[PDB]
Design a protein around this nucleic acid. Sequence first.
RNA 1: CGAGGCGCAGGCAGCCGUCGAACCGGGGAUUCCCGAAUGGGACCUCCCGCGGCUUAUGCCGCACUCCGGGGUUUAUCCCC
RNA 2: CCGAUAGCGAACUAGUACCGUGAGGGAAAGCUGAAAAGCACCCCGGGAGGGGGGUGAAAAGAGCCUGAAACCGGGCGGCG
RNA 3: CCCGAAACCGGUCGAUCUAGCCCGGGGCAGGGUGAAGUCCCUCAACCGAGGGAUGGAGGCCCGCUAGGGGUGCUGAUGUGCAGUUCGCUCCCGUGACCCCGGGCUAGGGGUGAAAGGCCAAUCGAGGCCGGAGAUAGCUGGUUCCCGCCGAAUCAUCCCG
RNA 4: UAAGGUCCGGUGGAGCCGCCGGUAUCGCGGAUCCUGCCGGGAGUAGCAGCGUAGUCGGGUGAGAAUCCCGACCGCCGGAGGGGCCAGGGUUCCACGGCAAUGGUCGUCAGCCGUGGGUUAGUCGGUCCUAACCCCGCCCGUAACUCGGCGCGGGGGAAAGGGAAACGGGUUUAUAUUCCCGUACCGCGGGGGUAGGUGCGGCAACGCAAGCCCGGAGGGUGACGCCUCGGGGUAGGCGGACCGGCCGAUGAGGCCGGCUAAGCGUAUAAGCCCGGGGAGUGCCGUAAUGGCGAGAACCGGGUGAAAGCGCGAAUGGCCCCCCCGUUAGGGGGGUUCCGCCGAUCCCUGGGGCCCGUGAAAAGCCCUCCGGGAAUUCCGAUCCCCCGCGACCGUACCGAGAACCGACACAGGUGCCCCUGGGUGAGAAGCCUAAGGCGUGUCGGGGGAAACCCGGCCGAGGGAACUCGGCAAACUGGCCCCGUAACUUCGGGAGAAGGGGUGCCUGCGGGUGCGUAACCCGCAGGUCGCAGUGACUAGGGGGGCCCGACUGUUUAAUAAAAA
RNA 5: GCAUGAAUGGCGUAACGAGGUCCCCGCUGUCCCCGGCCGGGGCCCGGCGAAACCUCUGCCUGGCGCGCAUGCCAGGGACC
RNA 6: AGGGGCCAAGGGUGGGGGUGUUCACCCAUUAAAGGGGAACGUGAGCUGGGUUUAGACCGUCGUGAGACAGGUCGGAUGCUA
Lengths: 150, 89, 239, 51, 62
Amino acid sequence: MNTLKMQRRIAAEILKCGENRIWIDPERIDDVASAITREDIKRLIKEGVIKKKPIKGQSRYRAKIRHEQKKKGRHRGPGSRKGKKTARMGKKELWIKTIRALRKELRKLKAQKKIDRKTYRMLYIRAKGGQFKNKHQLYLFLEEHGLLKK
Amino acid sequence: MKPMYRSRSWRRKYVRTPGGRVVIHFERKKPKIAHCAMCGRPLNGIPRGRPVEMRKLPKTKKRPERPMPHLCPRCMRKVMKEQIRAQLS
Amino acid sequence: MGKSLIQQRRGKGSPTFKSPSHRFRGAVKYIPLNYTQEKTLRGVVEEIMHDPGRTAPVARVKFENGIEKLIIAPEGLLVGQEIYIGPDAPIAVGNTLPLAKIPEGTYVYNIEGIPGDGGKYVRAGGTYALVVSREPDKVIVQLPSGELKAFNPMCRATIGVVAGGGRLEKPLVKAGKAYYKYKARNKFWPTPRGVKMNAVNHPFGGKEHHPGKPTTTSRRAPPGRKVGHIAARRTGRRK
Amino acid sequence: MARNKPLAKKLRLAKALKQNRRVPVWVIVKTNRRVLTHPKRRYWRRTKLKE
Amino acid sequence: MGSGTATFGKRNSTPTHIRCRRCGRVSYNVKKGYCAACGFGRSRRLRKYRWSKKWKKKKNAH
RNA sequence: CGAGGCGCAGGCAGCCGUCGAACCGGGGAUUCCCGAAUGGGACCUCCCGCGGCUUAUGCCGCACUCCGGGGUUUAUCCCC
RNA sequence: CCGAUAGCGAACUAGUACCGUGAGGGAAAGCUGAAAAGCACCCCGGGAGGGGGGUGAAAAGAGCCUGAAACCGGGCGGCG
RNA sequence: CCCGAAACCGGUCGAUCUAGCCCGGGGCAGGGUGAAGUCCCUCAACCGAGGGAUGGAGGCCCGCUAGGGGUGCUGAUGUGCAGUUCGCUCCCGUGACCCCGGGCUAGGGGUGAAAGGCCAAUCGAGGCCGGAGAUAGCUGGUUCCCGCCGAAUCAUCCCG
RNA sequence: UAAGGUCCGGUGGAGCCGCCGGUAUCGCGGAUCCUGCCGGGAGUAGCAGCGUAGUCGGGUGAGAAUCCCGACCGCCGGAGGGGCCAGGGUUCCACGGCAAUGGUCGUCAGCCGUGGGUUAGUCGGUCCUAACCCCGCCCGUAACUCGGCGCGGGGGAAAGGGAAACGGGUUUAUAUUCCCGUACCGCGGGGGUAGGUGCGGCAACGCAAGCCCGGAGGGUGACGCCUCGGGGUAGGCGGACCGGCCGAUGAGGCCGGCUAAGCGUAUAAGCCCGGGGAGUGCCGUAAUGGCGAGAACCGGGUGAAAGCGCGAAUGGCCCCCCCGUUAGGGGGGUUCCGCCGAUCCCUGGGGCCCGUGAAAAGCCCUCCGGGAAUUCCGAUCCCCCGCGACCGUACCGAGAACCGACACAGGUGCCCCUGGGUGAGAAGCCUAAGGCGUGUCGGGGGAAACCCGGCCGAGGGAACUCGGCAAACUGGCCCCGUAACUUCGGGAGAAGGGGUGCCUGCGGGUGCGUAACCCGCAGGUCGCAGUGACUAGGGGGGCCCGACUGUUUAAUAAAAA
RNA sequence: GCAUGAAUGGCGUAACGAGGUCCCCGCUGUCCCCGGCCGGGGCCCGGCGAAACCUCUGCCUGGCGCGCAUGCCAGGGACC
RNA sequence: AGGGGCCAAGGGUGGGGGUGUUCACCCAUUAAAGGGGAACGUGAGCUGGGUUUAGACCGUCGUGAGACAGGUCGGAUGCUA
């Protein structure tokens, strides 16, 4: 008899919510028992006898404070670190990063006229060959040379 | 769908219903580059499309105007030089 | 007594001992229905592929009567080389002509043994036959083994050498890489020894490492007992 | 899918299902105690089949 | 194979044997295309033998 | 044979039968699909090349392999 | 000749239930009474269970003719 | 008299288990090391020397990723949860790797990284049926009563 | 004597003796006999061991620890959740029950009884062909329901190849299928016009295709391995705005804010094209490297995903304020801005090789064109009329629907592998969506001995034992440093020593402008301990064997074999 | 060398191993010598409910005996 | 301090190192570190190293299969009274 097991599944599909979220009023068990249809469930939804729990969300406060602190250089001493050095930052990947600016830098300078077709070749080629630390170093080393400085 | 394994004809885009159901759809594989074949180069003015799609699409895509749309203009650049030498003698 | 042996299985044509024929590539044909005399025939190297089961590279050739067939590739071939077949083919590398028409003392491969059967001789990587002497009666050719066989002068052959030399110069490296090669070919492996095989499994050798009866076997010995050094004339490396 | 019955196999399955009834009470009266037990009763789980 | 029989037995799952077009017994092996009982697929004839099998059901039927 | 029946199977209900049932004999109608299964394959289903005919759906007849005889571009291909 | 632990695999729901991938393998299961009158009516009981009354006769009351032994309760005699 | 086993043989039936072979697919967190190959700087006439980068190989390492295996505990169980299991620990974990579906090979045959292992709770030659009520000098059993007489367990011969 | 005969009482309610002559599937205590029935064992063991789950009110009913509702307390987090293949076969769904079934009760259920449900032009089957198979024919065999070749045909993947569709709504049960909306395949008409069977642009090239039966040819269909980089966006999170909620103080947090397939219009790194013309030879990529068979460098063209609009004010979320036993409803307002970080998916290079990595159906083009053409023709352009032969769809898909006889701790494929916190992580723990409390027997004894899992042990530090077996210890990460030996590759993470937390304030890198992260530095300071948990190698040396990796007695031997 | 020896491979060997054996350092309930704790059983109750196996049974010691006895024989213990 | 003998089992008669070892060998202690029986006590108690399974190697033997109380690594320990 008195099902109600299906009526929950059915209510679940109409409400488009989880079974576990369904709230049936305790005073009105008899009224939900007499609910056979979805249309009945829908009536009972309007009358507020069948409801939905709210979906939670995990708080990110604790994340946020850490994230700001790690953005600021904190919580990252030698005592928080778990992976090996490259692990945090991929040695190929950083370099892949490193060289592109040294090249952008020279490229920017190629359009600006500051460096002749004649310096750039040595520099661009020097950048593939890893002389530069990078942005600050490239600027310094050419500045020493004289042609950048001009 | 009925294919589960991520087989070749299977491959997937995420699809949203607004229902917020979010269901997987199969996608048709992405186009391999038709060749000249007389010398291996991907052909300008030759489409890419899926081999089914070419049936219900247009023919303009499927060729360039010059003879032998299948081969590249430079390879044809050989072939006419030969054809005349052939009519001449 | 014991089961059929490792070799006896082979002969059945059962599938562990059946060559794949569906990953493997064409055979050589020269075709004699357009004959050698009254030639008509040149062709163009359409592509070059590796043939898995020959362990050598092979050529697809597009003939000018409209037939497509493979010819075993010579060294120093280009794609778009012209290969000719006939006697009125030029005398150069990759060109195919009868033995009589080929000079004496030139290197040659892909020699016929019955005229017009398409090549049944010298079709391996980097090895070559030498035409030592020629007489209108018979032309004697010196084989890869050092050994001289007399062939009809109206056999076909191709001038040059086979490609894919150095083949055994490079080693096979490991048991893995080797496993990989044998799948590409057909050759029952991993192959163990009879010596620690049980008395049922194999004619020689017992439970532990030592041979039963002598390894050296008759030339009238039975099937299934003809294992070891087969009809050995000598053995060893000493007086 | 489905799987993935063949049309006929469904006809056969349907038959076995039919065999898996319980007789009716009236036959039983007509018999006046009686053939009972219905002997075929096949349980989905309990038994197999044929296919 | 030997013991650990529970651990082993996930095949049978696949079927290779049915109600036969010809006889109706449980042996038309889908893979071979042969009925073990009747011999359909294999032979124009019904399987019957001196031992028998086929005969035994028939006599039993009489 | 002939005055009750409606298989095994005693129920409930209703029915049929002298223009003679049930039953027995002889003859005839219908006799799915698979099967030697014959057009082809199949896990008892499915597809298909002709020709007849009704306006169409519907419906009727056909094509595996011998022998016997034909037809003809004598395709050895098709028809009785 | 045997007579239902027997005789046919099978007195019946048998070549069934069931087993086995398959080839194949394969049981058990008979008895009311004169008539079903197959349990109305009445009392009780949650009660589809069960008890009293109701049949010529219910150790004839529903696998119901008879109704053993092992064995189980109670009671009688004896011992304890 | 009855029963009793390991066989042998003949015809059949299995590769939905499992072994290898083939087709066509799929799976495998993360991390390390760092080859060839390529580049540059400084120092040297050259010979080279020092430094750094880039690239990224492996029947490779670490790994309780999934997955595969199964070393020790001789632990737990041992009429089980289980006719081969459990936990910790342990090996492998881009591979001579694992896996799915199709398909091939059958009983003195196959198959075997070969242990006489495996070929469907059955393998130093599978199972089913028949021969078959095999035959055994060998074990077990062989059932009503009564009356009368009442043993030998030795000899010769014998693949005994 | 006896084997056995005979009489009485009770029971039973139709067949039965004696004598004489016959005959036998003719007499039972044993056969680890065979079959059938039954007791003790016992009211015992099991109903425990694996990551140990329930509990209070209340509803229902004869009966409630295990049925339902709420609250409260937990586990699970690639699975005890979601979608599915095989396989099962009505287990699905409703109503009525509990004799049986469910490792216990049962009012529940997968049981029993009775009814009902799987709807397809656009999903897949079906088609193709693979490895391979069969048939006829040829032939063999004494012969076949046997046998291999050669011909000819036919069959072979419900995860290969392949024509076309999604969203929303509805049902007790079904749905991409029924409905609504939007979209569209195939074939077959019709009506127009490009089309004197295409016009127009030097060119790199423009679309409103190219009359036509036929066969031919040619591309694409079409396939091994692994990096790296380029794009897509599912989507995780901060800020701001709009409501709902929770709420010491009225803050902070939680939550809803969505956009489909189909179209139209745009893709762009590869790849061609003009101009130009390689000066110590220049230039690029993350990288190898390109170039005088066309550089550097300028304009073009050209072929994946992607954006917008249509689709779509809708629809779907989310609230508000009124109608009420009830039914059926009504009117409202929000339905948003960025910037930022990611699996996969698609696209170039590149590295590899004693695996050099199936076909065809179909498209697209081209050659020829049997014929019909100027009263013409044709319909790739539009728009529009008609139609859809056949099978399948339920549910489960699992620590109760599979298989193992069992609802068996077993073990069988995929997909969700990118939820949040963590941290190298598809790891652990915790936690979200989602699921469950039927990995189905409860309660009691503070529960003693004993047994399993596990925790802790002074002093001593293997004295135990065949043996340090078991167990312990080390432990993440960073820095320092690193021997013997050596096939120079390695040994090596040797070894040993140091450090590691929080806070406060800085600097560097990448970028854009203060985002998203990451790497360092200094000061202040607490604890016994900063990998405080979880995660997490003990090390060193000699010798024997076998080179290694792998394999092995599937199930007492993993080894030296 | 009771009874080694060179492809029925000899010797030697870096690297490698869930391989055999030995030593050292740390460490440690393996041990001297065990305790306490914790959770699941044990144990009781309620409901549920099997198996192995079954001539019988209150002995112990000696003697005897198929020479390795509860049952014979002699003592002793002996309430269920 | 011994040697040798009598009475006497009440009590005591150990710990380690090698070996699978009962025995025995050794070390340092000790009063002394006695011997033998109980299914060569003790597996419905443990342990399972050794003996005598099925894997493997060496030596010897043997034509060979194959063998060894020769040497050697590995090789399960059931039950609810």
